Structure formats: C-alpha cells, structure tokens
Ligand binder design. Structure first.
Ligand SMILES: O=C(O)CN(CCN(CC(=O)O)Cc1cccc(O)c1O)Cc1ccccc1O
Ligand SMILES: [Cl-]
Ligand SMILES: [Cl-]
Ligand SMILES: [Cl-]
Ligand SMILES: [Cl-]
Length: 498
C-alpha cells in the first residue's frame, strides 16, 4: 500500500529501553517514547506531554502541568505518577548518565497530583528544558513494563506514548513499526515502517537501486558519496542534502608526544587543504570547518581566526620548535626522534580510511609521519575512552547538544575530549568554566564563559576541524519531500506525507 514504507538501518533497533544506550538506536527510541517538552528548530522547547510549567525564583524548583488525555500504547494512563516513576528509574542508574549534567542535578521528582509534576534541582541549571527534550534518557515507558520496579536491568514490552509502536524485531534481519491508532496527537499518514537490516553502505545503495527499499536517511555514512552524487542527477530518484548539522574533526592528544607540543598541533592545523579533502574523499558534499563549532551554533559566533591551509607556515612552526629534516629524509626529527603521530580509526569504514589516507599525505608534505592504525570498533572505542591515541576522528553532536552538552561532556574523564585535553595546563580552568557556564543565570557571564572556553580550545589547537556535515536523503519520488527533525538523531517519519 502507499501508506507502508521500507527503509534500512545498519543494525536492529535494539530492545527500545528508553533509559539505556547501545544497542538501543536513538531514532527508534524517539519513535516510541516522548518527552515532557519538545525541541524546535529555533532552539526553543514547546509543550508536549507537559502542557505548561513554572519555576521558583531561585530556579531550582520546577513544576510541570501535564496533559490529562494521554495513554501509553497499551491503554494505561500517562500521568504525573508514571512520569515520576520514570525519573526514579533513570536516576537509579545515575552514574550511567554522568555525561548529561541534568542527571547530576535532579534532587527529587514528585507527583503532586495526577497532573502536577515537581522536579527539584541541586542548582539553577540553565539547559534544564533542552535536556528534558533529548531522545534519551528522560522519556517515558509505561511503569507496568519495568522489571522489579526498575528499567536499568531491562524492560518488558517497549510501551511508549509515541506515534509509533514496535510490531516485531528479528536480530540481524529487520524491525517493523506501526502507527499508534490511539496516539494523543496527530495521526501519521504512514501506517507501517519496515527497517531492513543492511550493514554495508554499498548494499544499502544496491537495495535502493533494486526497489527493495523506499527511503534512506542519515549522515555522510548513509551510502557511498560517489553514489549519492550520481543518484542526485538520476531523474528516477529523489535526493536531499540538508544544511550542516555538526562538525567532523580530528582530536589531537595534548598529553602524548608529539601532539603534546602546541607548535605541533598548530602546524597540523595549517597542513590540511580541507576543500581538497572534501572534494577528494567526500565528493564535494560537505562544507569546510575551521572551528570546533560552526559560527551558526549558539554562543559560538566568536570571530575565531581560522588556520587556513598554509604549508609554509606549518613547516616554519615545526622548524621553530626544533623539528628539522635530516638528510635526505622527509620526516622531521627532534632529539633524534621522528615526528610520528598515530591516527586511529575503524578499519572497515571506507570513508574514514579515505580521509585518513588524505590526512597522512598532507601531513607528510610538512614532514610529519602519520601512521594509520585501522582497528575494529570495540578497540577504537577503548582507545578514545582511555586516551590511547595520537589523533582520532571525532564529531560533535548536533542540535540541541551543541554546544552546551558537548562541552559538559568534556569534563568526563572516560571520553575522547577529556583525554585529548588532558595535557593542557589550563584544563582545570576549562573544566571549572564549563561547570560555571551551565549554572549561571547572568547571560552576559554565560556568553563570556562560552567565549573563553571555545577560545582556549581553538587557540590551543586541541582539534583539527575538517568539515560541517549534512543529513542526506535518498527516496522514491512518490514519498515526496522528506522533512528533517530539529534533533539531529531523530527521523521525522510522522511528518512524511505522500
Ligand atoms: O555518544 C557519545 O559520545 C556519548 N553518549 C552521549 C552523547 N550522545 C547522546 C546519547 O547517546 O544519548 C550523542 C550521540 C549523537 C549521535 C549518535 C550517538 O550514538 C550519540 O550518542 C552516551 C553513549 C553511551 C553509550 C553508547 C552510546 C552513547 O552515545
Ligand atoms: Cl553501556
Ligand atoms: Cl549502537
Ligand atoms: Cl509554560
Ligand atoms: Cl623518510
């Protein structure tokens, strides 16, 4: 039927525990589970499951008035008690959510009545509403589906209030969702969505060409970029490329030789012709990035000075720092030790490998030897967590995470950004300022703190920004224009309208 669609994802959607992470897929958690307040493209939140809210003068006590007409898909009521139970279930696993500062801030959550929900915070945490709006963890499963009154040890059925219900899942095969016919809000036009499990980008493209799938929606890894460019000219197909959503960069390890040297990090930042990299590996589909956050990101229009491609300057920086070329070698040495940097990436990711090859070539031209370490996913994740890298590929998180949640997370030692920043003399100051920016009520101070944090990270050359990447779509023309969701990790299936 014209109201059933087939799409693809590299893996199954997972258990759809609203309160846990891998192997749960975020877009799918967002299809089934809903927030108190909903994030909009303009940075605001709107009423959602909560129709209104107020807060105390000290900004620490918040009271939400909930809708009274909402049922979970299994017919049980959504009310303040169910909401409170969800917050308990999440916070019973508090350490797992440490990355998200709201999880460290909530002191108590109480149902004052069926419609009145009160949340008390440790401090006047400014990004409160924005963090409630995220795909996870603060969304709501029917408390009847808790296991022993918890969710951290698993759930029973993935029962949400959302416009989609999971019908069935097959490990390594597919997942099927259907429209919730008892949804509180607007009925989606689409009645059924099947996700074929297709891990390889080439075979995803092939599945589209064969007519086996109707829609592909994702970031720069969705399908091969040469193929996407060809499809964009194919009159039988529809394609889209959004405005950019987030940054792709290298993170440089400030605590490990030779990237511990500011002059080395600055030189690497002048060595890469990013337009060439994009035109070579990414088929011209992305935009050049010269700062951690694009100037269009809130609080990040700071006039930071780009390091334009300038290999002469990169060489002069290295020379001044004592890295000089032996006869007749191309790789610089200092104290008889070679300028060698390891770049870790997922070895089976063709796009990462392509970018890595370009980066290696560019850095060789300024006398740096980049050794390519391609490993399995698990090993790469372990490297980022533990700081076992010279350089790694890394990305920001898109709206509404950027900048505040991404910065917040830089304070967490078991993540790539902290690990990359660990060697900076001003790392403690940066981390102090990040705490301060999240809690300040003074807008002038907030802007100044964001300026200082981002200026230090820029001036200290912690990152090598590469490009601002876009969402991509490939679809059968009959589906029409495909909208984007405000939150970068969500897919707006409910808005698709043939
Ligand atoms: O992604 C991280 O770096 C850390 N995560 C927090 C920030 N996340 C938001 C989120 O996951 O809710 C941003 C995020 C954005 C896009 C895709 C993701 O998988 C993704 O996680 C926590 C995490 C733990 C375990 C597995 C995956 C995880 O992402
Ligand atoms: Cl985990
Ligand atoms: Cl995952
Ligand atoms: Cl309000
Ligand atoms: Cl050599």
């Amino acid at each position: 039927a014209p109201d059933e669609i087939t799409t693809a994802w590299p893996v199954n959607v997972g258990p759809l525990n609203p309160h846990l992470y891998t192997p749960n897929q975020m877009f799918a958690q967002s299809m089934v589970y809903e927030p108190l307040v909903k994030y909009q493209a303009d940075g605001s939140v709107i009423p959602w499951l909560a129709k209104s809210w107020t807060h105390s003068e000290d900004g620490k006590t918040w009271t939400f008035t909930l809708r009274d007409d909402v049922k979970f898909s299994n017919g049980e009521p959504f009310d303040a008690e169910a909401a409170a139970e969800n917050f308990r279930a999440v916070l019973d696993n508090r350490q797992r959510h440490a990355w998200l500062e709201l999880a460290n801030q909530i002191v108590d959550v109480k149902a004052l009545s069926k419609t009145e929900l009160q949340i008390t915070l440790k401090s006047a945490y400014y990004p409160f509403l924005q963090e409630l709006a995220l795909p996870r963890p603060f969304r709501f499963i029917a408390p009847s589906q808790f296991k022993n009154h918890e969710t951290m040890n698993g759930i029973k059925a993935p029962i949400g209030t959302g416009p989609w219900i999971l019908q069935e899942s097959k490990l390594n095969q597919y997942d099927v969702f259907v429209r919730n016919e008892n949804y509180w809000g607007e009925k989606p036009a689409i009645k059924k969505i099947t996700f074929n499990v297709i891990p390889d980008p080439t075979t995803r493209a092939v599945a589209f060409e064969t007519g086996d799938i109707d829609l592909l929606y994702g970031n720069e890894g969705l399908l091969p970029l040469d193929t996407f460019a060809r499809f964009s000219q194919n009159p039988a197909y529809h394609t889209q490329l959004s405005q950019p959503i987030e940054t792709v960069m290298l993170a440089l390890n400030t605590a490990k030789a030779p990237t511990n040297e500011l002059a080395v990090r600055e030189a690497l930042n002048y060595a890469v012709n990013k337009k060439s990299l994009i035109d070579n590996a990414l088929y011209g589909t992305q935009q050049v990035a010269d700062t951690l956050f694009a100037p269009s990101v809130p609080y990040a229009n700071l006039g930071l000075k780009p390091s334009q491609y300038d290999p002469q300057k990169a060489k002069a920086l290295l020379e001044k720092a004592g890295w000089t070329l032996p006869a007749g070698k191309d790789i610089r040495e200092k104290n008889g030790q070679p300028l060698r940097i390891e770049l870790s990436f997922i070895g089976t990711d063709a796009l990462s490998k392509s970018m890595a090859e370009i980066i290696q070539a560019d850095m060789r031209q300024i006398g740096a030897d980049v050794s390519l370490i391609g490993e399995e996913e698990s090993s790469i994740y372990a490297r980022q967590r533990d700081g076992r890298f010279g350089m790694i590929f890394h990305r920001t998180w898109g709206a509404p995470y950027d900048p505040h949640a991404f910065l917040s997370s830089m304070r967490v030692p078991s993540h790539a950004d902290f690990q990359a920043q660990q060697g900076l003399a001003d790392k403690p100051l940066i981390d102090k300022e990040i705490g301060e920016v999240l809690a300040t009520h003074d807008e002038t101070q907030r802007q100044a703190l964001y300026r200082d944090i981002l200026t230090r990270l820029h001036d200290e050359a912690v990152y090598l920004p590469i490009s601002y990447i876009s969402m991509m779509v490939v679809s059968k023309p009959e589906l029409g224009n495909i909208p984007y969701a405000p939150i970068a990790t969500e897919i707006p299936f409910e808005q698709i309208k043939p």
